[PDB]
From Swiss-Prot, chain B:
It is linked to Ventricular tachycardia, catecholaminergic polymorphic, 1, with or without atrial dysfunction and/or dilated cardiomyopathy: An arrhythmogenic disorder characterized by stress-induced, bidirectional ventricular tachycardia that may degenerate into cardiac arrest and cause sudden death. Patients present with recurrent syncope, seizures, or sudden death after physical activity or emotional stress. CPVT1 inheritance is autosomal dominant. Ventricular arrhythmias due to cardiac ryanodine receptor calcium release deficiency syndrome: An autosomal dominant arrhythmogenic disorder characterized by syncope, cardiac arrest and/or sudden unexpected death, often in association with physical exertion or acute emotional stress. Patients who survive manifest polymorphic ventricular tachycardia and ventricular fibrillation. Unlike typical catecholaminergic ventricular tachycardia, arrhythmias are not reproducible on exercise stress testing or adrenaline challenge. Homotetramer. Can also form heterotetramers with RYR1 and RYR3. Interacts with FKBP1A and FKBP1B; these interactions may stabilize the channel in its closed state and prevent Ca(2+) leaks. Interacts with CALM and S100A1; these interactions regulate channel activity. Identified in a complex composed of RYR2, FKBP1B, PKA catalytic subunit, PRKAR2A, AKAP6, and the protein phosphatases PP2A and PP1. Interacts directly with FKBP1B, PKA, PP1 and PP2A. Interacts with SELENON. In cardiac muscles, identified in a complex, composed of FSD2, CMYA5 and RYR2. Detected in heart muscle (at protein level). Heart muscle, brain (cerebellum and hippocampus) and placenta. The lineage of its organism: Eukaryota, Metazoa, Chordata, Craniata, Vertebrata. Belongs to the ryanodine receptor (TC 1.A.3.1) family. RYR2 subfamily. It comes from Homo sapiens (Human). Cytosolic calcium-activated calcium channel that mediates the release of Ca(2+) from the sarcoplasmic reticulum into the cytosol and thereby plays a key role in triggering cardiac muscle contraction. Aberrant channel activation can lead to cardiac arrhythmia. In cardiac myocytes, calcium release is triggered by increased Ca(2+) cytosolic levels due to activation of the L-type calcium channel CACNA1C. The calcium channel activity is modulated by formation of heterotetramers with RYR3. Required for cellular calcium ion homeostasis. Required for embryonic heart development. Residues 164-374 form the B30.2/SPRY domain. It is found in: Sarcoplasmic reticulum membrane. This is Ryanodine receptor 2.
From Swiss-Prot, chain C:
GO terms for molecular function: calcium channel inhibitor activity; calcium channel regulator activity; FK506 binding; peptidyl-prolyl cis-trans isomerase activity; signaling receptor binding; transmembrane transporter binding. Identified in a complex composed of RYR2, FKBP1B, PKA catalytic subunit, PRKAR2A, AKAP6, and the protein phosphatases PP2A and PP1. Interacts directly with RYR2. GO terms for biological process: 'de novo' protein folding; calcium-mediated signaling; insulin secretion involved in cellular response to glucose stimulus; negative regulation of calcium-mediated signaling; negative regulation of heart rate; negative regulation of insulin secretion involved in cellular response to glucose stimulus; negative regulation of release of sequestered calcium ion into cytosol; neuronal action potential propagation. This is Peptidyl-prolyl cis-trans isomerase FKBP1B. It is an enzyme of class 5 (isomerase). The gene is FKBP1B.
Length: 444, 385, 107, 255, 283
């Protein structure tokens, strides 16, 4: 009786070879025993293949073939060194995958193909190449981060798959934070999109990651920005442009879907108070003038051309006062979102009361009242019918006051009638009056 | 010695340096393959630790300094003029041993290969020198096989120098191995390096050996043997005809070969001279044969275009008439009764002559030799037999 | 700048007229005699239609000055084919190209 | 070149030149492959593959060059695409069943109707008279049917001759005779050119008794060296993968 | 697609067939050796070759231990072949012991103890599936207190003077996990929210119970039967340059587990009823 089966034939042949001769090449031994194990574990083939099995309708066959060809190009281009032409090919292929429709329609196939793994492998190669030489081919990092952010936004399961790869992204979070126009194109943005609007992932967030982010933020307050001081921006001791990004990540970590994850908020508050350098020079406590004086100083910087600009493409001119103001607004927003919910305070949990007391000690009421009292500068029309427009990319923005209001509502609370009247008079009526004055069709 | 202190005052421990270099080569010698696997692993760990300690103590820079100090002298004779005669003889051996030690120190250690990246450019600057070419090539191969960074330092000028090493030093497979290592390292291909190597080496077609398929060519000749000498009873003029019954232009990818004319023996031996026994050579491919293909006159493997009425490469139903005169060295042809406008003169008449046709596969021809053997379609020229 | 000497005669009337696909077997060799290209090796005839700059201009008018069924050898001066740069990897710079071309069919 | 059996230096230099020719076009350098098509031509490659008196080193080098210039780029893509099963739902997919007929007898591996999506095969015609550069995409074209027929004939001859244990294997050694040939056969099988009766004949060559269609010794029982044993293991791995793909397609058909 | 996934998990994974003992018995047969032209020393059997390959891979010097699916599968196969697992009589139990001693002999006669020591040594104190499989194989070959295996392991350790083995053991002890009240509270919050991942939430508390139990069962079997020599060796490795106190490390891990259990008890102190997940964590 012959084997009559390929399985039995392999099982006989490999054993016969091994018992006939002592194989010297380790690769032959490995291959023979792998094949024998596959014959004796035939259910292994199914249990391994089925996870990577997908089904599509006939109408999407051509579109799937195009996506598979693009993925094959990107995969094959992992065996070649990073270069100009390879950069161009990565960019065209990733763009084709984005433009393709099955990428949106079938996220499960996209995840089963291991596409995010390939994109992040390209990113790892680019970032590793020249660690001491800073970053080369900076448009790979941008395009790959954008692709991964869209991949996260497609589906929740893809978001969890990207969350699995979190430690590396936070380790290289400082790739392109200082350079503008890269928003949504840095690994920190990928991490933020991976932990965005997911209670399960926010709760799965660990303490060491928050510690890493807090240390990066503390460094951004202790040390100036090397690239800005090299390009000629005036030197200040801290780095608002990166501090703002690191604060936005913590905002997304602590605040989710309208409520606040107390587990992730308490840790952030404790780390921030442990390292007071994260609060900026005004709030360090070592003779800091205060938030109200700091924002007035930033306004004066905004009018001053010398300190606002480098004074040796428009986005390259980082308006220094606006950067400081945005940093302070982001810090206040993060703290307000970390403030506990009022129902827990009603319940009387001691930890929430302690956190609220800490926040109130950190930020006095008067400073918030003053910052709310500060007003903008209205655009006006000349003779000619051309309304002059103060640069919105600079100057004081209503978004800055929005964070102040959020903190005031979430921490201090408006529960006293004369206090509400005083707040109204000092800061809310002037804003509404300015809005009403800006109601003309030309100014609208 | 460079500062020109007198020779006997300066002391050069030549023998000590040679013996120490040999001992260090033995120290860094790689393990033998017949050793058992555990011994393999132990010796490999010991060699790796030795290399790491030497690199941390900076034993590689000292070797480079000695090498640089030794290359200031152009030749062994010059070094023997400056230093002593014994140093003169030992100078080549010491220089080779230093390069061997460098190769043994950097081989198999990725960290050392990476730290040698900065010094790569200085190393390849003396590749042209015959005194150190082999050692420099070995060191470069050892660096490139294991240092992915090194390929990022190797540039277009270095690739050109490596290629020109083949042109100036002749065929050497180690340069080819270095060029192969340049293309791909650790499964990753450097496309810029591939493009430069291709565009700088391949188009020349002057260094690498070339290959092509050549149709086999055979030769048909009659028994007659024609010669001229003083006091010899042989007529000086002869004439025969060839008829082409059928000829396929392209039986294979190459053009069909069909040449007719006269060939000359060497001396008085009955063997054709000056040509290979077998291959792609036929009538006119040497200086002992003279041929016609219908468009060109073939002699000495050189073809010159000759005009004729209605020029065409030999086709079906063509009558070729060949005329040989030995009174004055002269070979002339005539196609289909129309005389071709070219002829040979002043060729060697020492040897014997005979008709010959050379061909590849796909011909159908007949020898119209005259008389009982044939009938001439065109009546022979006057005085021609 | 293209000289043509016939190797085998053709009909002499059916010249290539414009907007027409030409079926040719060609064999390209450098001036020294080294072959670099041949359609007979690939064993499929070459197709190109006239006036659209698909092929080199020497091969253009050298095939245009021909007739159906005619075999001829086409000598191309460097300025008509790969003038100064040359073809990367195959043709060296400033090279004169020799082509053996047969016009099998016109459609 | 057959004379190079006695000139050692020329043989070594030419073998390393062939290796360099492979290296420059390694890993999908299609422009370099198109350039090398001028130097090493199709008729030369076929002659080198078919010839019996060629030295072993040159034979292996020419086999590797033929694989690298023409058949490596698509084989690599299909190998990277192998472990993934995207099957459309069509009539052909629904018609697929685990077993061919009523009795539970295994069908011959590879043979059957497979509807899983696989990479497209596209080749470019290498010509240096055309000016357009669109030909630089896609590897150069080759006569795959002729290559298939020659590979089958050569394997049939080699299996029969090697069993007699002659003293003159092609290339001088059994390794030189078998490794390049099995490598070309494995590359073609991976590409998927083999179909129907060709697959049946080559499986009969691999093993007569087992793959017998409804003495003679196959490749598995001829006591081959270790390098050829590794290639046989690769071939058997591919056969097992084909069986797994058929099983997956039948499961999707039932679903 | 949903049916493919569900069918996979529910049927293909759950399908179980037993082949390990037959495969090992067929792999251990010296096949037609006298008919073969051995003409020298006895050729090693295929199982011996597999063990030698796996041992050489571990002995190869390298910074980290890479996951090898071949080792992952074959260690499991060999462990299942060893164990192959109402009141029984004296003869029945003694037959069970004798059959186990032969099923273990088939592997410790070919160098399995040296492999399971080498892999643990090369692990360098990094918890992983390779270490888990090696520990399971060691337990399988050491069940019942195999004196021959204990002697082989002790002789190997003393002869090659390996400190990496004990260092890796200490690192694994440190890496072993305990109850995590913070993770438990986060899982409870997620469950209260309503989107529940039972596969993910459960594993976070007490990360690797099976790994910890196997790691300590290996250590107990290493001294099983009152092996005084190895008991003293675990305390103080006399020959080696560096000594690691495995006994004190075990005591420290016990102290950490006690604190974790006490904290969990304090969290359930006020609550009158213990939930099912809390009961599972306690168990």
């Amino acid at each position: 009786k012959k084997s009559s089966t390929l399985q039995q034939l392999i099982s006989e042949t490999m054993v016969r070879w091994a018992q006939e001769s002592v194989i010297e090449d380790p690769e032959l031994v490995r291959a023979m025993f792998v094949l024998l194990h596959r014959q004796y574990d035939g259910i292994g083939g199914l249990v391994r293949a089925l996870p990577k099995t997908y089904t599509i309708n006939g109408v999407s066959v051509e579109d799937t073939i195009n996506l598979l060809a693009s993925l094959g190009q990107i995969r094959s281009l992992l065996s070649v060194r990073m270069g100009k032409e390879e950069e161009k090919l990565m960019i065209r292929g990733l763009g084709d995958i984005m433009n393709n429709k099955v990428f949106y329609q079938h996220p499960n196939l996209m995840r089963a193909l291991g596409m995010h793994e390939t994109v992040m492998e390209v990113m790892v190669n680019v970032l590793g190449g020249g660690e001491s030489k800073e970053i080369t081919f900076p448009k790979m990092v941008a395009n790959c981060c954008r692709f991964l952010c869209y991949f996260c936004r497609i589906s929740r399961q893809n978001q969890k798959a990207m969350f699995d790869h979190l430690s590396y992204l936070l380790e290289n979070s400082s790739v392109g934070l200082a350079s503008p126009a890269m928003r949504g194109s840095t690994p920190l943005d990928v991490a933020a999109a991976s932990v965005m609007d997911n209670n399960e992932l926010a709760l799965a967030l660990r303490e060491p990651d928050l510690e890493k982010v807090v240390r990066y933020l503390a460094g951004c307050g202790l040390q100036s920005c090397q690239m800005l001081v090299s390009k000629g921006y005036p030197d200040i001791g801290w780095n608002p442009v990166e501090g703002e990004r690191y604060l936005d990540f913590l905002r997304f970590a602590v605040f989710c879907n309208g409520e606040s994850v107390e587990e992730n908020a308490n840790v952030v508050v404790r780390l921030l108070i442990r390292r007071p350098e994260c609060f900026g020079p005004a709030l360090r406590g070592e003779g800091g003038n205060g938030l109200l004086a700091a924002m007035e100083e930033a306004i004066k910087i905004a009018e001053d051309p010398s300190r606002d600009g480098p004074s040796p493409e428009e986005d390259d001119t980082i308006h220094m006062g606006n950067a400081i103001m945005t940093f302070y607004s982001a810090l206040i927003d993060l703290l307000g979102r970390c403030a506990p919910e009022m129902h827990l305070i009603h319940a009387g949990k001691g930890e929430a009361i302690r956190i609220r007391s800490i926040l109130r000690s950190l930020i006095p009421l008067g400073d918030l009242v003053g910052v709310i009292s500060i007003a903008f500068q209205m655009p006006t029309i000349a003779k000619d019918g051309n309304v002059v427009e103060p640069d919105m990319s600079a100057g004081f923005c209503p978004d800055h006051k929005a964070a102040m209001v959020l903190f005031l509502d979430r921490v201090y609370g408006i529960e006293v009638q004369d206090f509400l009247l005083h707040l109204l008079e000092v800061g809310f009526l002037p804003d509404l009056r300015a809005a009403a004055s800006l109601d003309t069709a030309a100014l609208s | 010695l460079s500062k020109k202190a007198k020779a006997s005052t300066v002391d050069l421990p030549i023998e000590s340096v040679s013996l120490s270099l040999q001992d260090l080569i033995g120290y860094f010698h790689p393990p033998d393959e017949h050793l058992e696997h555990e011994d393999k692993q132990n010796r490999l760990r010991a060699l790796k630790n030795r290399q790491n300690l030497f690199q941390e103590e900076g034993m590689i820079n000292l070797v480079l300094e000695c090498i640089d100090r030794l290359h200031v002298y152009s030749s062994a004779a010059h070094f023997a003029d400056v230093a002593g005669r014994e140093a003169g003889e030992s100078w080549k051996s010491i220089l080779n041993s230093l390069y061997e030690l460098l190769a043994a120190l950097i081989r198999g250690n990725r960290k050392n290969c990476a730290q040698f990246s900065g010094s790569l450019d200085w190393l390849i600057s003396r590749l042209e020198r015959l005194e150190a070419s082999s050692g420099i090539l070995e060191v470069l191969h050892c660096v490139l096989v294991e240092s992915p960074e090194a390929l990022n330092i190797i540039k277009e000028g270095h690739i050109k120098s490596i290629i020109s090493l083949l042109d100036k030093h002749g065929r050497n497979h180690k340069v080819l191995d270095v060029l192969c290592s340049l293309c791909v390292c650790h499964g990753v291909a450097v496309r810029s390096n591939q493009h430069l190597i291709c565009d700088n080496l391949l188009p020349g077609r002057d260094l690498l050996l070339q290959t092509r398929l050549v149709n086999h060519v055979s030769s048909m000749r009659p028994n007659i043997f024609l010669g001229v000498s003083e006091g010899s009873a042989q007529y000086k003029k002869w004439y025969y005809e060839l008829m082409v019954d059928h000829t396929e232009p392209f039986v294979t990818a190459e053009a069909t070969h069909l040449r007719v004319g006269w060939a000359s023996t060497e001396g008085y031996s009955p063997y054709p001279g000056g040509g290979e026994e077998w291959g792609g050579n036929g009538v006119g491919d040497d200086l002992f044969s003279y041929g016609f293909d219908g468009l060109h006159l073939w002699s000495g493997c050189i073809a010159r275009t000759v005009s004729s009425p209605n020029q065409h490469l030999l086709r079906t139903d063509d009558v070729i008439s060949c005329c040989l005169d030995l009174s004055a060295p002269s070979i002339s042809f005539r196609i289909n009764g129309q005389p071709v406008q070219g002829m040979f003169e002043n060729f060697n008449i020492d040897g014997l002559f005979f008709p010959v046709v050379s061909f590849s596969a796909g011909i159908k021809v007949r020898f119209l030799l005259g008389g009982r053997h044939g009938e001439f379609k065109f009546l022979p020229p006057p005085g021609y037999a | 700048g293209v000289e043509i000497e016939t190797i085998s005669p053709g009909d002499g009337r059916t010249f290539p007229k414009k907007g027409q696909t030409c079926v040719v077997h060609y064999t390209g060799m450098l001036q020294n005699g080294k072959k670099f290209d041949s359609s007979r090796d690939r064993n499929k005839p070459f197709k190109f239609r006239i006036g659209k700059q698909e092929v080199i201009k020497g091969f253009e008018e050298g095939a245009a000055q021909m007739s159906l069924g005619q075999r001829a050898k086409l000598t191309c001066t460097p300025d008509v084919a790969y003038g100064a740069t040359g073809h990367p990897g195959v043709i060296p710079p400033n090279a004169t190209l020799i082509f053996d071309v047969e016009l099998l069919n016109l459609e | 070149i057959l004379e190079l059996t006695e000139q050692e230096e020329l043989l070594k230099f030419h073998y390393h030149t062939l290796r360099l020719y492979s290296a420059v076009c390694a890993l999908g350098n299609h422009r370099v492959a198109h350039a090398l098509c001028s130097h090493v031509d199709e008729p030369q490659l076929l002659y080198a593959i078919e010839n019996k008196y060629m030295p072993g080193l040159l034979r292996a080098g020419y086999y590797d060059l033929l694989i690298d210039i023409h058949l490596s780029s698509y084989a690599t893509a299909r190998l990277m695409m192998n472990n993934e099963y995207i099957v459309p739902m069509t009539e052909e997919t629904k018609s697929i069943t685990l077993f061919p007929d009523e009795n539970k007898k295994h069908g011959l591996p590879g043979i059957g109707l497979s509807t899983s999506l696989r990479p497209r095969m596209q080749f470019s015609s290498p010509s240096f008279v055309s000016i357009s550069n669109e030909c630089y995409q896609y590897s150069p074209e080759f006569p795959l049917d002729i290559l298939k027929s020659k590979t089958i004939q050569m394997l049939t001859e080699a299996v029969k001759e090697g069993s007699l244990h002659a003293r003159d294997p092609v290339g001088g050694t059994t390794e030189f005779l078998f490794v390049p040939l099995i490598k070309l056969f494995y590359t073609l099988l991976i590409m998927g050119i083999f179909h129907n009766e060709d697959l049946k004949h080559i499986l009969q060559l691999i093993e007569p008794s087992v793959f017998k269609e409804a003495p003679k010794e196959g490749l598995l029982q001829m006591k081959l060296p270790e390098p050829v044993k590794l290639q046989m293991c690769l071939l058997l791995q591919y056969l097992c993968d084909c069986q797994v793909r058929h099983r997956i397609e039948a499961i999707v058909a039932f679903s | 697609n949903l049916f493919l996934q569900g069918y996979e998990k529910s049927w293909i994974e759950t399908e179980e067939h037993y082949f390990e003992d037959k495969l090992i018995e067929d792999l251990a047969k010296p096949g037609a050796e006298p008919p073969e032209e051995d003409e020298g020393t006895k050729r090693v059997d295929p199982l011996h070759q597999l063990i030698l390959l796996f041992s050489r891979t571990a002995l190869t010097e390298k910074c980290k231990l890479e996951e090898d699916f071949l080792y992952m599968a074959y260690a499991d196969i060999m462990a299942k072949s060893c164990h192959d697992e109402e009141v029984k009589s004296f003869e029945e139990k003694e037959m069970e012991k004798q059959k186990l001693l032969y099923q273990q002999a088939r592997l410790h006669d070919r160098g399995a103890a040296e492999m399971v020591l080498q892999t643990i040594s090369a692990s360098k104190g990094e918890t992983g599936p390779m270490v888990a499989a090696t520990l399971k194989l060691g337990i399988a070959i050491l069940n019942g207190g195999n004196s021959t295996v204990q002697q082989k392991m002790l002789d190997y350790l003393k002869e090659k003077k390996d400190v990496g083995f004990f260092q890796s053991l200490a690192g694994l002890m440190q890496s072993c996990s305990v109850l995590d009240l913070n993770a438990f509270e986060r899982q409870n919050k997620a469950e209260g929210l309503g989107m529940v991942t039972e596969e993910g939430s459960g594993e976070k508390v007490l990360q690797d119970d099976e790994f910890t139990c196997d790691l300590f069962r290996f250590l107990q079997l290493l001294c099983e039967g009152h092996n005084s020599d190895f008991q003293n060796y675990l305390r103080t490795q006399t020959g080696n340059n560096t000594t690691v106190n495995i006994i004190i490390s075990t005591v420290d891990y016990l102290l950490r587990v006690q604190e974790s259990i006490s904290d969990f008890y304090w969290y359930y102190s006020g609550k009158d009823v213990i939930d099912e997940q809390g009961q599972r964590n306690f168990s």
